[PDB]
Ligand binder design. Structure first.
Ligand SMILES: [Fe+3]
Ligand SMILES: [Fe+3]
Lengths: 383, 167, 510, 383, 76
């Protein structure tokens, strides 16, 4: 018997319900300070889910945790990062992603991708791709790039555990899933091509050997290993990973090299895959920007303090990223020269774009001085 | 006794006033270390400010951290404890101590005291967390060996509690 | 070759184990006694795009039912009040478990060495975000459509006032993330989800519909579809450490501590919410507990793990012994301290009392007698100046808080099996209530320093504590919590103050 | 009072409902002959919705229509097309699209497209597109192609009204909407570029002038005008439009010219749009193939009869399409020479692909003899 | 200029009237006594993608209610 439809229970229930509302405040978690005009559903469903006490900036609870680690490490604590703020709950993802819209959007991408592949194979459009680009550059080097995305994904494991608020945790996990999705989409592209071109080997053996032993990815692999396993400050991981390394090396490899060149060598397939990785990069950027610039670098009480650490980290990881790009440009020696694209002038402009965009998007925001021409020369030394 | 309100009270206010007087890294480091030794962990010297010590500790931490960024060269922020020691040296010294512990009782005091003395902002976070993890691993292995071997009556004696009532 | 082809998720999954690579520093950042094997495989071959596709399809059906159908049917206010109040607690308390399970699953992802094992944990990280938003959504929906939005609309702050919340934080928040990752995993997946959450989600939908709530079944039936992956994660955690000699030495100790931990709060709290928080009853908690814990989990689930050296927990016998009266004992504390909550309670009526006495012979002579006395003294009437917590103190029936589990204990009125131990250590007094938790505190005092409500509120008058914690409705003076579920005669801060209830230090007598 | 929840009505209703089912056949329209193993929901919801009488092959109704046109033209009649079949209901779209899955899929595409554009603009990837390709070829000539798609869309107006069964009508309307969607996506691309590149004119004035007066599209415009307004046999319109004209001229223009060349001139934007038009082409093809090959050309009683008309129409419209391609290849004279792509050898291979695929996909199926090399030379005369 | 921008349906709709072109045979195939004016405008500025988006959202709510809620309630 369901109380909603059973005539007798429904009657009993109707008798117990008062004929007036006992309060008029119907806005779920009405006390959350809205970032925009009115409270959004994203804020309502996400904010204050984390039960922080008052001794962790912004928390509404009190007292110590009920159970801590052996030795005394708190469930969540201030010792987890160098950065400080007056409120750890302040962050808002500009895209307002709670779980539902996040999977909804990715689901659209999942299903459309499969319709696109069935049609692409029926079209026979792989017929005009440059076979060298396909066999030597795409299969091997694009394949090896999946490990960088995968290392960035893995870097988020400790962040997911250690970060200090619910909005941050959501931003970090979605960022992680998008990174592993990028790695799986690269592998999906390689497996798809293997079905079309007899003899094309989609196994990861070669790409793995290239990521771990090829000088072209040596600096990238070293930096990713460091970001993932060499540190635990969760803010350092996110900043270094997305705002420095991925914003310079990753943007260069994905956009300036594999996507741009695919449209120089007649590759009509790859741009469908990088369209996704690049859309994920920009969505992730909006959130990372809110966390580091609006919330932390501009904290009214700790902004200068935080900029001190953000500037220190940037100097260190930018040097690593420049070294990684220095090694990576050695890949241009294996491709057909194309003026304005793979020649010295082409690479140089691709580098000005990457560093020039990075300066506006990140550096200028935290007060980090950077000489774009010097960074371009630093990398061109590897050309 | 009579407690004042949870979040805003005279105890928290009085301490915030003392903290505002801190002007140097070495003074604030001594302050935070004494504070942690006097008021934190089960071996603290005093439970008088039990309900406010965590918030006050956070405020000392904020002061020290700001003094660090304003007065210390950037390189120091990454590689040194505010006591002036090299962070890597502190890590090695404390792993060595716990590795020499012969009982869970000695191992536990070493892990607890490391935290009271070196918790950030005294030691850089990356070094502190990996040291704290190494110490925890050893403490658990010692403690979890034959966990149920000693009867409660014995454990009470070993711990040194004063049994006030047993139903 | 122009045949139309695509790439199935399992095709990509086949290569996932190969995504990880060897490097010196490639090891977990968290303290642990164990080593998860690097060749561990996962049961579900899921990739990021396929995960989104699967989940989004379920969401569309769920949200369609809620926002379209049930809203057109005015279902939000067709719920029995007792149950609609209970849902303020159940949904938000479960919310913290889903939320902290995100952080826990991330920690386990960090702990695993195999790409597949990390992937199985990752899927759970995402699922737990999904459930956090689903628990929130139930309260959000209730806030818009149910006759009493207070408490459904602000539990993330109002839960901090009361003692019941402290216990929930131990089992479903701190217990999930603070300790050896394997200990956390046993708390979360092996015991928490396999023993309690999985059958609980389902049970809640039954009690909910029985009581006119069709909102909860819509959401929870959807949450249930993800839970199998999580139980599979628990299973894989065991398989992954089975060949590590450390598991022979430590696993059964971590499992026993976790089982005790989880049962200590759920045995009394779930029976209390189900039996006292509903009008229509589905079945007695004693029978449910035996089926879930002793039969299903203890027998079938734990039995399958025997091949990996997992033993039925040593403390199972003790837990079973306590699973008859413990929730009734807890109800005394919960009704006595009703103003500290964020839900409206209903004393059992004549019909409920007959049902309790029929299922728990002896209930009427102990608990029923006390509830009837409280009713006579004015439990429900704002003008009485009567709060039962005061009655307990005056009559020498002190309430203590277990330093470890945070679960309240009234030794003089309890029929369950706990027993009080009060120790002084380094100038501070501590009350423990059972052998398993006393051992935990004696061996690991630094893991258990949680301030209890008496320590925090000592010497303060009750209405001041409630006001400070925002335990009031929008008029700023009527309490969110109430000792009855009627629409009139609601208590205000002034009515509470009238009682002159001041918090003592219960250990000051020792 | 709702009878489902009102205690008294629900009680009255419960009393009236029998305690047993009055029939056990719960399969909606169980008598439809399934094409596949079991009846699909697509067949259940679509089949026999059209109320045809027995005098229109396959109809289950009887008698004359209740109201006819002045003069006597039937609501639907055999006089609407030359082709004959033993059952007009036989057609099945292989994609099984009833309205819901159709809008669901397109909705995924609509929303993803906007996320892609917001990110693409944030990326600044338009910076590396060849400005000549952008300004002269894309803006003008790609812009003019929207009129061909739009004319093909319009050709379906009379088909929508005149065709003889429900499955056919669905196939035809979805095919139409996809054609106008293609025209609107081309215009959306042009408007998007105008927001990025100051001075880029997204107005349709020039593209319209090119479609109506440029020799490059003269033959295409003549053929589209004929297919749309010169005939009314609804089967002739679908066959000519999709299976001949769009399968040769359209596939060449969209895939061999604008998509292929975009990936030679550094255009990372256009391939996102042609990915859609090409996926729509292949989905439409599966349905057109079922209607003309499986149902009509292979009708057990009228297959030979129908192949006679299909062969006659193909000869006529293929000549028109070859003439249209002949004019269109004059566009190669306005682009930068690129060996293997825009040179005589490149165009020749692009043409072998188009005609070679067309022969396998359509011609061989209806018994139409075609010499691919002759058709390639016929068009190369315009190069 | 890297501001994030997209293209709204009304932006595309603004150019729709210009998609048709003049040619001798451009006239209706059906018998009629009337002539519909060629400058007629429509009230709803809908394009193919926006039509699908609008409709699919309504369907999800409808089918969710039927296949999930009402079926669980035995409403049939
Ligand atoms: Fe969950
Ligand atoms: Fe779960």
């Amino acid at each position: 018997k369901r109380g909603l439809t059973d005539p007798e229970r429904a009657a009993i229930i109707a008798a117990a319900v008062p004929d007036h509302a006992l309060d008029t405040q119907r806005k779920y978690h009405y006390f959350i300070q809205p970032r925009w005009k009115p409270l959004s559903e994203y804020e309502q469903l996400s904010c204050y889910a984390q039960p922080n006490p008052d001794w962790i900036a912004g928390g509404l609870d009190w007292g110590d945790w009920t159970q801590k680690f052996h030795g005394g490490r708190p469930s969540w604590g201030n010792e987890s990062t160098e950065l400080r703020t007056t409120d750890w709950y302040r962050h808002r993802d500009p895209a307002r992603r709670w779980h539902h819209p996040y999977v909804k959007d990715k689901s659209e991408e999942a299903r459309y991708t499969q319709r696109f592949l069935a049609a692409y194979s029926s079209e026979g459009s792989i017929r005009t791709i440059d076979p060298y680009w396909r066999d030597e550059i795409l299969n091997k080097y694009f394949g090896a790039l999946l490990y960088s995305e995968y290392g960035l994904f893995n870097a988020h494991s400790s962040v997911g555990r250690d970060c200090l608020s619910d909005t941050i945790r959501q931003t970090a996990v979605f960022a992680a899933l998008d990174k592993v999705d990028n790695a799986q989409m690269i592998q999906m592209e390689r497996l798809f091509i293997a079905k079309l071109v007899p003899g094309f080997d989609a196994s990861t053996d070669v790409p793995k050997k290239i990521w771990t032993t090829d000088p072209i990815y040596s600096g990238a692999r070293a930096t990713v290993q460091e970001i993932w396993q060499g540190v635990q400050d969760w803010n350092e991981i996110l900043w270094a990973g997305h705002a420095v390394y991925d914003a310079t090396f990753g943007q260069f490899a994905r956009r300036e090299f594999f996507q741009r060149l695919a449209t120089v060598y007649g590759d009509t397939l790859t741009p469908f895959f990088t369209a996704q990785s690049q859309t994920y990069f920009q969505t992730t950027r909006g959130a990372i920007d809110d966390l580091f610039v609006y919330c932390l670098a501009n904290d009214s009480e700790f902004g200068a303090h935080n900029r001190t650490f953000l500037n220190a980290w940037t100097e260190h990881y930018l040097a690593s990223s420049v070294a990684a790009l220095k090694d990576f440009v050695g890949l241009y020696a294996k491709v057909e020269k194309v003026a304005g694209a793979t020649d010295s002038a082409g690479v140089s402009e691709a580098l000005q774009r990457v560093f020039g965009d990075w300066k506006i998007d990140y550096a200028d925001k935290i007060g980090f001085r950077v000489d774009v021409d010097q960074k371009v020369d630093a990398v061109l030394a590897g050309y | 006794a009579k407690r004042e309100p949870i979040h805003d009270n005279s105890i928290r206010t009085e301490w915030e006033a003392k903290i505002a007087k801190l002007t140097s890294v070495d003074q604030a480091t001594k302050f935070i270390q004494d504070f942690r030794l006097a008021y934190t962990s089960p071996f603290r010297k005093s439970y008088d400010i039990d309900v406010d010590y965590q918030y006050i500790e956070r405020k000392i931490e904020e002061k020290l951290s700001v003094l660090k960024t304003e007065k210390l060269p950037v390189a120091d922020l990454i590689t040194k404890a505010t006591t002036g020691e090299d962070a890597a040296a502190v890590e090695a010294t404390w792993i060595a101590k716990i590795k020499a512990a012969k009982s869970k009782y000695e191992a536990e005091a070493i892990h607890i005291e490391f935290r009271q003395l070196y918790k950030p902002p005294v030691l850089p976070v990356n070094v502190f967390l990996r040291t704290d993890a190494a110490l925890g691993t050893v403490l658990m292995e010692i403690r979890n060996t034959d966990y149920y071997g000693t009867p409660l009556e014995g454990l009470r004696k070993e711990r040194g509690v004063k049994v006030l009532h047993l139903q | 070759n122009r045949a139309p082809v695509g790439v199935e998720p399992q095709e990509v999954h086949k290569w996932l184990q190969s995504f990880n690579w060897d490097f010196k520093e490639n090891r977990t950042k968290y303290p642990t006694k164990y080593h998860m094997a690097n060749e561990t495989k996962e049961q579900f071959k899921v990739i990021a795009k396929e995960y989104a596709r699967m989940e989004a399809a379920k969401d569309e059906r769920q949200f369609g039912t809620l926002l379209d159908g049930l809203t057109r049917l005015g279902a939000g206010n067709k719920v029995h009040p007792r149950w609609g109040e209970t849902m303020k607690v159940i949904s938000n308390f479960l919310e913290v478990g889903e939320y902290n399970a995100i952080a826990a699953s991330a920690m386990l992802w960090d702990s695993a060495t195999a790409a597949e094992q990390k992937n199985g944990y990752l899927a759970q990280v995402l699922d737990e975000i999904r459930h956090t938003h689903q628990c929130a959504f139930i309260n959000h929906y209730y806030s818009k459509h149910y006759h009493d939005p207070a408490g459904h609309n602000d539990a993330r702050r109002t839960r901090a006032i009361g003692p019941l919340w402290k216990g929930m934080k131990r089992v479903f928040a701190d217990g999930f993330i603070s300790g050896d990752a394997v200990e956390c995993s046993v708390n979360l997946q092996l015991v928490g989800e396999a023993c309690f959450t999985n059958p609980l989600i389902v049970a809640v939908t039954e009690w909910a519909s029985a009581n006119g709530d069709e909102i909860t079944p819509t959401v929870f039936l959807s949450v249930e579809t993800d839970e199998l992956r999580h139980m599979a994660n628990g299973y894989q955690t065991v398989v992954s450490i089975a060949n590590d000699p450390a598991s022979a030495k430590f696993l059964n100790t971590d499992l026993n501590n976790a089982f005790w931990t989880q049962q200590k709060y759920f045995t009394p709290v779930l029976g209390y919410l189900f039996e006292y928080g509903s009008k229509f009853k589905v079945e007695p908690w004693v029978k449910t507990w035996n089926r879930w814990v002793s039969e299903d989990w203890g027998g079938i689930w734990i039995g399958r793990l025997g091949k990996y050296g997992v033993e039925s927990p040593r403390s199972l016998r003790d837990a079973k012994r306590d699973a008859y009266w413990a929730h009734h004992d807890l109800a005394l504390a919960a009704y006595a301290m009703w103003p500290l909550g964020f839900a409206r309670l209903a004393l059992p009526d004549e019909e409920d009392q007959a049902w309790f006495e029929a299922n728990y012979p002896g209930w009427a002579d102990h608990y029923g007698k006390i509830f009837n006395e409280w009713k006579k003294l004015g439990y429900e009437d704002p003008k009485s100046g009567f709060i039962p917590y005061q009655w307990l103190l005056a009559n020498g029936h002190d309430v203590y808080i277990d330093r470890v589990s945070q679960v309240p204990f009234i030794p003089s009125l309890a029929k369950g099996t706990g027993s009080l131990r009060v120790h002084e250590f380094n100038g501070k007094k501590h009350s423990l209530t059972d052998d398993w938790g006393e051992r935990q505190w004696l061996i690991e005092p630094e893991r258990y320093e949680c301030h209890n409500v008496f320590e925090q509120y000592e010497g303060r008058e009750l209405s001041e504590v409630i006001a400070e914690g925002h335990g009031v409705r929008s008029d700023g003076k009527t309490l969110i919590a109430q000792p009855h579920t009627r629409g009139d005669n609601l208590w205000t801060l002034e009515d509470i103050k009238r009682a002159g209830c001041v918090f003592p230090d219960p250990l000051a007598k020792f």
